[PDB]
Amino acid sequence: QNPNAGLFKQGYNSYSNADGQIIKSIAAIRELHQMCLTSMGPCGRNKIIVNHLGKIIITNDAATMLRELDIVHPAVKVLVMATEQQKIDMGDGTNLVMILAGELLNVSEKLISMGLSAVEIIQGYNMARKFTLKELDEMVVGEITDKNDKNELLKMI
Amino acid sequence: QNPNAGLFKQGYNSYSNADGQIIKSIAAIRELHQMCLTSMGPCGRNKIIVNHLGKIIITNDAATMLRELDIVHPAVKVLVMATEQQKIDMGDGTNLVMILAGELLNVSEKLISMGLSAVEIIQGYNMARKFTLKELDEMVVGEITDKNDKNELLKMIKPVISSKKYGSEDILSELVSEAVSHVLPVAFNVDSIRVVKIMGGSLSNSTVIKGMVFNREPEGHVKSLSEDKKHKVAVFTCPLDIANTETKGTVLLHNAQEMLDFSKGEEKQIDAMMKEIADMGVECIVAGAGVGELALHYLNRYGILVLKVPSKFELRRLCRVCGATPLPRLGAPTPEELGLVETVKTMEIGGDRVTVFKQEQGEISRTSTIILRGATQNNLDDIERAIDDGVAAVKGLMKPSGGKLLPGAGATEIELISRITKYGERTPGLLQLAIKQFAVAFEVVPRTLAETAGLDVNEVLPNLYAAHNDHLYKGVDIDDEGVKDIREENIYDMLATKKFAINVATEAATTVLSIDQIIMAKK
Amino acid sequence: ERTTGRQAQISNITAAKAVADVIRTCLGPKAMLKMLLDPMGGLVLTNDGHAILREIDVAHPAAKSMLELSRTQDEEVGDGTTTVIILAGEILAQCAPYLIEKNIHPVIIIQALKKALTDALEVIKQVSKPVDVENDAAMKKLIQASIGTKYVIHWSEKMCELALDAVKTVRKDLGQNFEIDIKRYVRVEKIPGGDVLDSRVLKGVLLNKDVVHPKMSRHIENPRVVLLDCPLEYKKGESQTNIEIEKEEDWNRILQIEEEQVQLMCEQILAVRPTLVITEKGVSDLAQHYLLKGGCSVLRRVKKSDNNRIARVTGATIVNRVEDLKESDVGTNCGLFKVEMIGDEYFSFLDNCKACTIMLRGGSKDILNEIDRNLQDAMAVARNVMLSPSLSPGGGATEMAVSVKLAEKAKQLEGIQQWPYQAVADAMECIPRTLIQNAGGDPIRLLSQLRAKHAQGNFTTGIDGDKGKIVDMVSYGIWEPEVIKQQSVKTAIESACLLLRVDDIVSGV
Amino acid sequence: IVVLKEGTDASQGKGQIISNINACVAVQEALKPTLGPLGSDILIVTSNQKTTISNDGATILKLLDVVHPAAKTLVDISRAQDAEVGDGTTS
Amino acid sequence: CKKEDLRRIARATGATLVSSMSNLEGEETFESSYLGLCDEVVQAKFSDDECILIKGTSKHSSSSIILRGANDYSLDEMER
Amino acid sequence: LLNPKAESLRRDAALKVNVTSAEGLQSVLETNLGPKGTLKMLVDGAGNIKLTKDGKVLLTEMQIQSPTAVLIARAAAAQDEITGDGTTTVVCLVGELLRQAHRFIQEGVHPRIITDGFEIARKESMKFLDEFKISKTNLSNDREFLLQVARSSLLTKVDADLTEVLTPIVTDAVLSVYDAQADNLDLHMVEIMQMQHLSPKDTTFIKGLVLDHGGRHPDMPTRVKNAYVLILNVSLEYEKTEVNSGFFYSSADQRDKLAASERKFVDAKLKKIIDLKNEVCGMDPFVIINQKGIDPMSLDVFAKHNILALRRAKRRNMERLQLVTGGEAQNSVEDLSPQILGFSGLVYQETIGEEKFTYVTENTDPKSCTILIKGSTHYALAQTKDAVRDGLRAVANVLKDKNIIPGAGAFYIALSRYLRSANMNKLGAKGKTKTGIEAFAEALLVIPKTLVKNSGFDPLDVLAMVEDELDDAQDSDETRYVGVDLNIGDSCDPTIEGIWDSYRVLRNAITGATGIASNLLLCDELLRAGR
Numbered sequence A: 001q002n003p004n005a006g007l008f009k010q011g012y013n014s015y016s017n018a019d020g021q022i023i024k025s026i027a028a029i030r031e032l033h034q035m036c037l038t039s040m041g042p043c044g045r046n047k048i049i050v051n052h053l054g055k056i057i058i059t060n061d062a063a064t065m066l067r068e069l070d071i072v073h074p075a076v077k078v079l080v081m082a083t084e085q086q087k088i089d090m091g092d093g094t095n096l097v098m099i100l101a102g103e104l105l106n107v108s109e110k111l112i113s114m115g116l117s118a119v120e121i122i123q124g125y126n127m128a129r130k131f132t133l134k135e136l137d138e139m140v141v142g143e144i145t146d147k148n149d150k151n152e153l154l155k156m157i
Numbered sequence B: 001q002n003p004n005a006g007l008f009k010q011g012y013n014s015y016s017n018a019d020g021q022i023i024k025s026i027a028a029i030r031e032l033h034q035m036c037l038t039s040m041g042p043c044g045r046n047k048i049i050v051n052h053l054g055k056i057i058i059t060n061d062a063a064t065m066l067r068e069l070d071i072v073h074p075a076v077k078v079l080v081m082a083t084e085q086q087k088i089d090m091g092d093g094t095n096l097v098m099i100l101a102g103e104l105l106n107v108s109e110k111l112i113s114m115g116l117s118a119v120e121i122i123q124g125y126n127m128a129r130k131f132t133l134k135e136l137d138e139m140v141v142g143e144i145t146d147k148n149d150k151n152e153l154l155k156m157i158k159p160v161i162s163s164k165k166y167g168s169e170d171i172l173s174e175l176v177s178e179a180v181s182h183v184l185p186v187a188f189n190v191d192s193i194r195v196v197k198i199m200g201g202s203l204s205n206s207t208v209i210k211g212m213v214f215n216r217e218p219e220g221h222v223k224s225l226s227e228d229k230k231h232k233v234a235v236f237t238c239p240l241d242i243a244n245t246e247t248k249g250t251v252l253l254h255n256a257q258e259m260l261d262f263s264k265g266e267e268k269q270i271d272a273m274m275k276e277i278a279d280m281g282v283e284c285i286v287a288g289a290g291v292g293e294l295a296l297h298y299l300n301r302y303g304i305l306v307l308k309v310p311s312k313f314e315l316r317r318l319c320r321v322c323g324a325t326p327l328p329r330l331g332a333p334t335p336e337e338l339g340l341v342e343t344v345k346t347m348e349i350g351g352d353r354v355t356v357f358k359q360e361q362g363e364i365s366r367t368s369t370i371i372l373r374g375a376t377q378n379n380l381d382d383i384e385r386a387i388d389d390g391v392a393a394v395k396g397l398m399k400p401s402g403g404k405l406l407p408g409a410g411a412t413e414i415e416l417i418s419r420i421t422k423y424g425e426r427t428p429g430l431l432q433l434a435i436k437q438f439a440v441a442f443e444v445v446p447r448t449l450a451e452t453a454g455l456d457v458n459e460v461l462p463n464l465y466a467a468h469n470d471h472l473y474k475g476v477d478i479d480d481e482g483v484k485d486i487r488e489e490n491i492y493d494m495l496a497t498k499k500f501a502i503n504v505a506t507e508a509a510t511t512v513l514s515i516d517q518i519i520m521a522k523k
Numbered sequence C: 001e002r003t004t005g006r007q008a009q010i011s012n013i014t015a016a017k018a019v020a021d022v023i024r025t026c027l028g029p030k031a032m033l034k035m036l037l038d039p040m041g042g043l044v045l046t047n048d049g050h051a052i053l054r055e056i057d058v059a060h061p062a063a064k065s066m067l068e069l070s071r072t073q074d075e076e077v078g079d080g081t082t083t084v085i086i087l088a089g090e091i092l093a094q095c096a097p098y099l100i101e102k103n104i105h106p107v108i109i110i111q112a113l114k115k116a117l118t119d120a121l122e123v124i125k126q127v128s129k130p131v132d133v134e135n136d137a138a139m140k141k142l143i144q145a146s147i148g149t150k151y152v153i154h155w156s157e158k159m160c161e162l163a164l165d166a167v168k169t170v171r172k173d174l175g176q177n178f179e180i181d182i183k184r185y186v187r188v189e190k191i192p193g194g195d196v197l198d199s200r201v202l203k204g205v206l207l208n209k210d211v212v213h214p215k216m217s218r219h220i221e222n223p224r225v226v227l228l229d230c231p232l233e234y235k236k237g238e239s240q241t242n243i244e245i246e247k248e249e250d251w252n253r254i255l256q257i258e259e260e261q262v263q264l265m266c267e268q269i270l271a272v273r274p275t276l277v278i279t280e281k282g283v284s285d286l287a288q289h290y291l292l293k294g295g296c297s298v299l300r301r302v303k304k305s306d307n308n309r310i311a312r313v314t315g316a317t318i319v320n321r322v323e324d325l326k327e328s329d330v331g332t333n334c335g336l337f338k339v340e341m342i343g344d345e346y347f348s349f350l351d352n353c354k355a356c357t358i359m360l361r362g363g364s365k366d367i368l369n370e371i372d373r374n375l376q377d378a379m380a381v382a383r384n385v386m387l388s389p390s391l392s393p394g395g396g397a398t399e400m401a402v403s404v405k406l407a408e409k410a411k412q413l414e415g416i417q418q419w420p421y422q423a424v425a426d427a428m429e430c431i432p433r434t435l436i437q438n439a440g441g442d443p444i445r446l447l448s449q450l451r452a453k454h455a456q457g458n459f460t461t462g463i464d465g466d467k468g469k470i471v472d473m474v475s476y477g478i479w480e481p482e483v484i485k486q487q488s489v490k491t492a493i494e495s496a497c498l499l500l501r502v503d504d505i506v507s508g509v
Numbered sequence D: 001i002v003v004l005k006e007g008t009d010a011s012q013g014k015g016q017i018i019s020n021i022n023a024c025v026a027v028q029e030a031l032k033p034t035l036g037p038l039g040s041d042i043l044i045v046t047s048n049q050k051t052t053i054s055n056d057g058a059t060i061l062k063l064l065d066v067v068h069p070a071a072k073t074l075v076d077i078s079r080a081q082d083a084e085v086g087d088g089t090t091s
Numbered sequence E: 001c002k003k004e005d006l007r008r009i010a011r012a013t014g015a016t017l018v019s020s021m022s023n024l025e026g027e028e029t030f031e032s033s034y035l036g037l038c039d040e041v042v043q044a045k046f047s048d049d050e051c052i053l054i055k056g057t058s059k060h061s062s063s064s065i066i067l068r069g070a071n072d073y074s075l076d077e078m079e080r
Numbered sequence F: 001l002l003n004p005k006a007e008s009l010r011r012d013a014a015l016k017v018n019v020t021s022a023e024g025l026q027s028v029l030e031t032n033l034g035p036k037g038t039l040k041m042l043v044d045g046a047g048n049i050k051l052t053k054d055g056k057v058l059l060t061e062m063q064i065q066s067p068t069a070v071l072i073a074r075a076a077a078a079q080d081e082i083t084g085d086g087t088t089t090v091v092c093l094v095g096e097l098l099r100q101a102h103r104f105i106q107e108g109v110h111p112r113i114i115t116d117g118f119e120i121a122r123k124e125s126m127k128f129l130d131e132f133k134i135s136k137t138n139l140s141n142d143r144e145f146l147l148q149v150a151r152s153s154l155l156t157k158v159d160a161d162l163t164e165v166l167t168p169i170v171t172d173a174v175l176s177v178y179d180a181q182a183d184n185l186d187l188h189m190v191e192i193m194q195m196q197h198l199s200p201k202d203t204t205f206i207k208g209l210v211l212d213h214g215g216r217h218p219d220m221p222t223r224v225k226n227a228y229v230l231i232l233n234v235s236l237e238y239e240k241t242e243v244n245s246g247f248f249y250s251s252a253d254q255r256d257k258l259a260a261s262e263r264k265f266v267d268a269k270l271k272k273i274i275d276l277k278n279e280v281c282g283m284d285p286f287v288i289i290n291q292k293g294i295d296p297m298s299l300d301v302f303a304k305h306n307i308l309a310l311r312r313a314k315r316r317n318m319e320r321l322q323l324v325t326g327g328e329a330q331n332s333v334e335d336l337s338p339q340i341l342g343f344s345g346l347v348y349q350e351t352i353g354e355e356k357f358t359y360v361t362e363n364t365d366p367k368s369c370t371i372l373i374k375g376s377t378h379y380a381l382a383q384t385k386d387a388v389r390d391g392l393r394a395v396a397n398v399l400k401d402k403n404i405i406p407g408a409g410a411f412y413i414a415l416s417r418y419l420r421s422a423n424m425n426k427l428g429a430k431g432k433t434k435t436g437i438e439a440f441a442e443a444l445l446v447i448p449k450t451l452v453k454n455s456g457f458d459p460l461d462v463l464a465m466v467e468d469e470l471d472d473a474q475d476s477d478e479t480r481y482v483g484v485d486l487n488i489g490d491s492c493d494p495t496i497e498g499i500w501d502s503y504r505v506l507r508n509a510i511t512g513a514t515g516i517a518s519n520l521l522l523c524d525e526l527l528r529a530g531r
């Protein structure tokens, strides 16, 4: 009975944001966030991921779990991407990129609720980010004397 | 890949005329036209139509073929409708309504080709039609003196029987004109000519009785009555037995007396009812209703010939043979209610026993029967179709001056060609086209008669034309040389018929042109 | 199969939140029409919340609970339907974080929400002003208020009229509270065509049933009405009544008796000298005749509901057996008996030139159902006030007041018990916001200003619909029955409290 | 309408840890009889069709296939034991 | 009516559950002999619904509670 | 957001669809609009050919599945169900209305602004009508004016020559039932007997009442010339015991005695009438009709005394006959007076082979005629009736509403222009709401355009002419009605040609189409939930 309009392409699925899409995505992310939120920290736990070719894997690390999973949500693949940057371009901190990137988008909807524009939240976030890198350059307490003295290495690793 | 638009209804099929639909329809009609175009005329052929329930049928007639077929094209059903008008409202001319209605639409596209509007062709056709009825009222040559004189009837029914059953054209029309006179008083009802038929011999043995024949047997030992004039007869709506009570009605018995006595009690009570009527002179009682056991038993003793005839349509046409009157109850058969029968015996026809109900002079009958003998049941049926065709045309010559008549063999038609065209290039404007076409249309009646006669139409047609321009009797020589003369054989289509037809064909053919879009649905 | 943990909780919250999401664009003066397709065939082109959610089957349990909220609310007050859904959601949603993020147990969040509700309800009655339930002008500009946001507004005044002119008509105080059974005593009657204004509130009834016999009165001046249960034809025995006859002329005897009893029956009726006899059951052809010359017009087959409303605008109490037909069962107090033929369809009227019959006219059988429902909302908020002469600051003003008095208190409570309380406050704010949004203005902007102006400068300050600027209610006024603001917040906080009690969901009878 | 894994099971919770324990217990209770001087012995006819009979707990836990992640570690530590030592595998 | 209520509506107005007016060999509901004394019988409404109340009675002592909630889902459980 | 299953066109897609469909339905019915329309021939799933050009016919005769196409259909049927005319116009008006509105929606304007405009325009349209109409004197007996109303609402569905055949037959009928001196009328009192055989041009007007069920008995009156007429309604046939009964004869002929005992109840009530045809004209100067039955034995009794007995009559004929003759609808035979029979002159039963056809010719106080529709086939017999009804309810409307409106789209081309220059110097509207009334205004030009679009002459051009030949008599003052001449391509005076649109139709067409369209435009989501 119900008609259907404006279709001439092929059989896709268009999720217009004017359909509360940003939140549909926050959801998908929210789900994989909880997985990483309990892997970080010494008090973190492991997860046994079982390969799509059938291999057991157990890891505290985040960039690895995500790697071994069959992610599919486009808005999620994006954050799994950032977990790659971290593992390649740093090897460490892979877990913290997730937890924040997600938590950012979490306390992000609170704003979208009020009425804050997308572009407004973006800008404010970058403004707050660049500002956040500054403090870190000075929030810095000690600094290893670059000693590279074997014992000095053990204080870092 | 290809899209599709403007659809929100359900799965139909809309044939917009702006898609050359009028012609798609002319096609469908064109197809069933050829079937009728070879059935008309004495030189017509039959078709064996085999029922959708599986029954064989063979008929020259057109309205019958169409009836027995599973037509489906909306533009065609319309012309099949007109063939119904003709069969109901005239019984004859059913074939000519098709051939014209179609031929009209055929020479109709020639116009649509040029550019002539739908509405323009319609108008021009009606203008040419009304004009065509006028001439027919005056193109009329003779007119039967309404004589109704038996011999005068045979002059009319003979041309109707030929070109339906040509060959026994006279043995037939004679056989019917004789059935009609027996019921026509001295200063009409089609029903008063019931027709029976039975396998055996050929038609040469066909007959005409002054009353109907029945199949069942006389019921009592009363086999068949006597051969001495007059026989008092009593008809009954009620059944011969102790009536009953529509609300239950059970016999009760409190004491043995009731019983012992009830037994023979009703026994004689039946005798009573029987007796008393047998007394009033009756000797033949036709029982439209049931007949009790004891009842017939007593009557058997009173030589009362019985005849169960449940057919309330037969019983009624029966009374109009003897003179009797149907009696709702039982017991008061007034000497007035009774009727007289000359013969009521049992004859074996073709091997099987049947009861008769005729008269040899005294007590005239208003319901005669034509007993047709034949060998092929099939054929024998198409004959009863011809007997109706004639009768229908007779009941039509009645009261309002139906005797009027014009040349058959298409002779009339040829004249009508020129005469309608007279009006053609005489009316100003572009209507002149359609009016002229409407005239060409009338060339089907002649041409086909020749075509069906194996005559080279391209020869008979011009011949019959120049032979029409005092002498507008020249028609198509069914059998030879050029044409022949209508008068040469006392053959002609009466006005009432051929006129009403032209009017029905013009409606049919016109409504088909008024439709400028069609919509169907899944079945 | 099973889903324990926050897993459960979440899906419940999201479910409930989604329910809101659908009709949120139906709350406001510029509210749109959700043309829904019912299974049976036809359609529903209404924007009246409950009438939408009814036409949408849902799956998730919470979404089922959330959906029935709109119903129980549409049963208390006729209005405030969409609002309860939106609030009921935002409450659960605004708890979502402190529910798991701040790991507060469901018991605690419930203990607070139940507390914050009562305080919140105070602030409602606190800002509510009373009203003259009798002042025709106040009632009109009250009913008018809840007629906006609906297709029926282009005749707003005309509507409140038919509203009051019917609320008051079927009303009947009674005291030994006020009883207004709009349902059984205000039978509506939607008739296709004409104009909207061409509709009136006939003080009587309107049946399309014609007259039992041709030569019968088309309209008795002041008719004497007689309403009855029992039919008008030869009755039969409720036992094994079987007759045995062998006594010949006895058939005629019994067959006659039938005519005889129909006679008697006509007598008992004719006795109290009636002009109009309306029975719920049939009317034997014979009985018609004896009631014809008996001098009265007859109406066969009329619904109980149709009949018992007649017996309130004719006084004619309905009576079964006729040999008991009293004369008190008159037909006094009943104007004419018109029988207007409305477009090839005969009707019959019973106006008097306790129960009225609102007769609506519009432009389609379809468009009328819009009106009927719209009207019901009017005629219901009228009834509410009749039974609670208190009103609340419309334009979402009330909703914002409670937002602050609660927000303030919450902030000054201290203890984990604060977060859930705080949320109820943050929640409430969504209504002036949904309004401002469906208006087009900037939510973050207008609210901060509405909220501030509220914080000090009066509390009867809501947002103006077609405008989009914050206005004071008193100013252009749009108060709504205080009762609505009760339920909307009563059950919404309850709903939330129920679903929050769930930590597990299972499937199988 | 969107998804995040394409129909691919994954359990969590406190029960998850308990499932795994019990899972391992099974593979454990399995070898308990093959222990001690008077220890029972097993007869495994793998889907291979090769019939074997032994007590090297390693050899038994190798013929059990075992796919449960958790319970599958008991198969690993049993193999290592038959390496760095050579005996005690059962235990 | 619910016969499980009348049994308790009657012990509560002191009345008598009239099985069939007889006693020895006659016929009567026996004026106030079988009847019950109640303070007031009223049909209170509750939105949508509307039931009867026999509040205040001779020897009733009795009570009866009526839950009101958000919907049937919570309500069934409230009572539950 | 959602739950499995259940689809829903949302946002501007839903509006896109709604307008889409409407525009569509519009184009599909435009063809059968105007006298110069198109005759479609639609056949059902059984092969029942049927011709039409009446929007309603074509509309309720089709299976539509488009939700918007229904709300528009239903509102259009609800129009032929009140004004009985203009079912076609209303579908175009809601169509063209949505197109004109979609243009300003497409540019940005919130629909609520185009709906606001519509209501505003609507009122102004209905005001303008009351100032545009033409109060015609209640004075009937002006058959001349009414015969122009008959032809007006007839050429919209008739074979041209047949218009002239039915134009009177309809008017005389309406009049014949109408009660002069203001009062009222109920068309139900105009029987519309229809019979096959002989084309639909042969149909006739009977001042009396024609029926089917004739005297079913041989020795019956073939034609009761000049006589009384009994309006009967009591069962003149065998009956049964309303309580379970049964006979039990113990004696041989006791049977018989009980046989007649059953029938005797008949004759009891049957005698009370047979002596009435004695007690009146018991010497020749007669016919009973009866709604119920008349068994065999009884038909004899009546046939015996030459009393034409009819049985099973259309029950609404009680009232129709009670006007064609005057006699009371005699329910029971007890209190039956000889001074309450009715009277008719020639009352003859034309038998058409198995078919009986009793007429009630020659009357003194008719007040209830019968339009006998003739016709060779069923398809024509169908359409011819659907033409009479749509043109009879059309004349009787000219009476009810003592006003009339010039046709040829005069009123539309008028209101259209008016609204244009109105708000230009009215401002008695609103802010950006001018859009909506502007649309509504331009919208109205449907009828004039479509009217000629069907004829042929270019809509844009000929309508331009009316716009000129119009203000011509405005820049020269004086009022001159202008319409589109669907024969030439120039304008003309509707009133002079004899072209009229019934007032109540226009009043329920505009208020109607707007009701739908204006409520469609405020739609933003098409649900489809609830298995």
Ligand SMILES: Nc1ncnc2c1ncn2[C@@H]1O[C@H](COP(=O)(O)OP(=O)(O)O)[C@@H](O)[C@H]1O
Pocket: B039, B040, B041, B042, B044, B061, B062, B092, B093, B094, B095, B096, B097, B159, B160, B162, B163, B164, B407, B408, B409, B410, B445, B449, B475, B476, B478, B491, B493
């Ligand atoms: N004897 C005949 N010779 C020439 N034409 C005849 C003869 N008899 C009948 N016809 C022609 O038969 C034609 C009609 O065809 P027919 O088969 O009789 O169909 P119908 O009579 O049903 O139209 C008439 O035009 C008539 O001229």
Ligand SMILES: Nc1ncnc2c1ncn2[C@@H]1O[C@H](COP(=O)(O)OP(=O)(O)O)[C@@H](O)[C@H]1O
Pocket: C026, C027, C028, C029, C031, C048, C049, C079, C080, C081, C082, C083, C084, C145, C146, C148, C149, C393, C394, C395, C396, C397, C431, C435, C463, C464, C465, C466, C478, C480
């Ligand atoms: N005229 C208006 N201007 C601003 N707010 C309005 C106006 N009309 C209704 N309201 C507010 O919007 C809500 C009513 O909207 P409505 O769409 O009628 O929802 P419901 O179905 O709950 O009545 C209430 O908060 C009321 O205060």
Ligand SMILES: Nc1ncnc2c1ncn2[C@@H]1O[C@H](COP(=O)(O)OP(=O)(O)O)[C@@H](O)[C@H]1O
Pocket: F032, F033, F034, F035, F037, F054, F055, F085, F086, F087, F088, F089, F090, F152, F155, F156, F407, F408, F409, F410, F447, F451, F483, F484, F485, F486, F499, F501
């Ligand atoms: N001959 C005519 N010339 C101009 N207008 C006419 C003419 N005859 C009737 N019309 C127009 O016919 C229109 C109605 O179309 P019609 O086909 O009757 O559909 P409906 O009446 O169902 O809307 C009226 O608006 C009227 O103005």
Ligand code: BEF
Pocket: A060, A061, A062, A091, A092, A093, A094, A095
């Ligand atoms: F998991 Be991280 F890289 F320490």
Ligand code: BEF
Pocket: B060, B061, B062, B091, B092, B093, B094, B095, B160, B163, B164, B389
């Ligand atoms: F075929 Be026809 F009727 F002579």
Ligand code: BEF
Pocket: C047, C048, C049, C050, C078, C079, C080, C081, C082, C146, C149, C377
């Ligand atoms: F919009 Be609500 F239901 F009055």
Ligand code: BEF
Pocket: D055, D056, D057, D086, D087, D088, D089, D090
């Ligand atoms: F089984 Be063990 F290796 F002794």
Ligand code: BEF
Pocket: F032, F053, F054, F055, F056, F084, F085, F086, F087, F088, F156, F390
């Ligand atoms: F074609 Be409409 F109904 F006059």
Ligand SMILES: [Mg+2]
Pocket: B092, B093, B159, B160, B161, B163, B164, B389
């Ligand atoms: Mg012939």
Ligand SMILES: [Mg+2]
Pocket: C079, C080, C081, C146, C147, C149, C377
């Ligand atoms: Mg409301």
Ligand SMILES: [Mg+2]
Pocket: F085, F086, F153, F156
């Ligand atoms: Mg019309």
